[PDB]
Structure 1
Amino acid sequence: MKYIQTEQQIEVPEGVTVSIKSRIVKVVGPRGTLTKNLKHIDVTFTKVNNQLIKVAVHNGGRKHVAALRTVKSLVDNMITGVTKGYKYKMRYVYAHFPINVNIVEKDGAKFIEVRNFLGDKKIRNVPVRDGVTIEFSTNVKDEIVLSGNSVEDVSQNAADLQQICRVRNKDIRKFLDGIYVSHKGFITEDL
């Protein structure tokens, strides 16, 4: 209907300070910093006090207005990992062949290496992105964990990890083998 003006409030936690000119954002904090571009979007960010920021949209058509409640959540998800940090646990799974995952380094590089997947002689190699670290958690049989600041390199690095292990030409349902994103959380415990 062409809403006249929207707003939300990005709650700034302490630590952290989020400079913004144009629609470049810069998440400075305890765990590191994070930056992002939004030139594509059209919103007016407005300081009220260190603790608070009001990201508006004047005269928005309905599709413009959903892009206002995402922005917020985008600027929150650079605050969050910058303080509490993200941790994307992955469990392996297998009816028979034991999946063996390792980390090599060829030229720099940081490759997850993923072997003997359904007793393939293949090797699957995921490129570990920057920001993010890979732990093979003891105490937990089988649990690769990806742990960064961002969310929106982690959940991907993981996602790829999960998606390089797709079964071909079988019925999904019998062959449930693969690596999967069971856990999602933060570096800091309690919260």
Structure 2
Amino acid sequence: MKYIQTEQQIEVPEGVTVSIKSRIVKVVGPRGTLTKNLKHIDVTFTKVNNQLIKVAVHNGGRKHVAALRTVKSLVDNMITGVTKGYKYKMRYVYAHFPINVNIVEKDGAKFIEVRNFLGDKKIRNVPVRDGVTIEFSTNVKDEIVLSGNSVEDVSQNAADLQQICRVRNKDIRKFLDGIYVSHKGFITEDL
């Protein structure tokens, strides 16, 4: 019905405030400092009481209407992604045969070199985006740490890393070696 404004009370704590100019938002945090460009939705923020944010969003009769909620969720991903982070604790539940996974270093990209993958001798150099540390197993058998500081730089690559061993004939029940996400938890245990 063509709404004039759809302001949303965004709760933003101190110490992790953002910079507002045009359509660019700054991510301020001790744990890594990254940026983000937004040129497809055209948003505008307004400061009135530091924490809360009250603005005016027009066009409410198509697909816009509440185009603040779709941004507010992205804002929280930059606040809880620099403080709480996003540690995707993925567990490698597989039998068959002990796969020798050795991640090497190359031009600071860390290409995951998978040797002998269920009888395959193909080296799948999966590209890894910067901003996330990847470890191995320490106390728990088969566990990879995907602790990053972003969403479109960690979860985006994880989706391509999972669907990189797609087989024409075989699928998922051929062997219980499918790489699935156990629990999408966070870095901070308390939060």
CA shift, 1:38, in A, is 1.7
> Residue 185 of structure 1 aligns with which residue?
185
CA shift, 1:55, in A, is 5.3
Report the number of matched residues: 191
- Of the structure 1 ranges 21-30 and 94-103, higher mean CA displacement relative to structure 2 is found in 94-103
Structure-2 separation of matches of 1:166 and 1:177: 12
Q: Which runs of 5+ in 1 are unaligned?
A: none
User: What TM-score comes out, normalization by structure 1 length?
Assistant: 0.89
Q: Detail structure 1 runs of 4+ shifted over 6 Å in the superposition.
A: none
Check the 8 A contact 2:109/2:129 in 1, yes or no.
no
Structure-1 separation of matches of 2:56 and 2:9: 9
CA deviations over 1:104-155 (Å, ceiling 9, x no partner)? 0123331122332221111112111111100213121111111111122111
Q: Which runs of 5+ in 2 are unaligned?
A: none
- Of the structure 1 ranges 35-44 and 79-88, higher mean CA displacement relative to structure 2 is found in 35-44
Structure with the bigger percentage of helix: 2
Query: RMSD of the alignment, in Å?
Result: 1.9
Check the 8 A contact 1:15/1:83 in 2, yes or no.
no
Structure with the bigger percentage of strand: 2
The 1:40–1:119 alpha-carbon spacing in structure 2 relative to 1, beyond 3 Å, is same
Check the 8 A contact 2:172/2:178 in 1, yes or no.
no
Structure-1 separation of matches of 2:57 and 2:147: 35
Check the 8 A contact 2:109/2:130 in 1, yes or no.
no
Structure-1 separation of matches of 2:159 and 2:189: 23
Structure-1 separation of matches of 2:69 and 2:155: 21
- Of the structure 1 ranges 151-160 and 23-32, higher mean CA displacement relative to structure 2 is found in 151-160
The 1:30–1:107 alpha-carbon spacing in structure 2 relative to 1, beyond 3 Å, is closer
CA shift, 1:66, in A, is 4.7
User: What TM-score comes out, normalization by structure 2 length?
Assistant: 0.89
Check the 8 A contact 1:15/1:30 in 2, yes or no.
no
- Of the structure 1 ranges 119-128 and 99-108, higher mean CA displacement relative to structure 2 is found in 99-108
CA shift, 1:30, in A, is 2.3
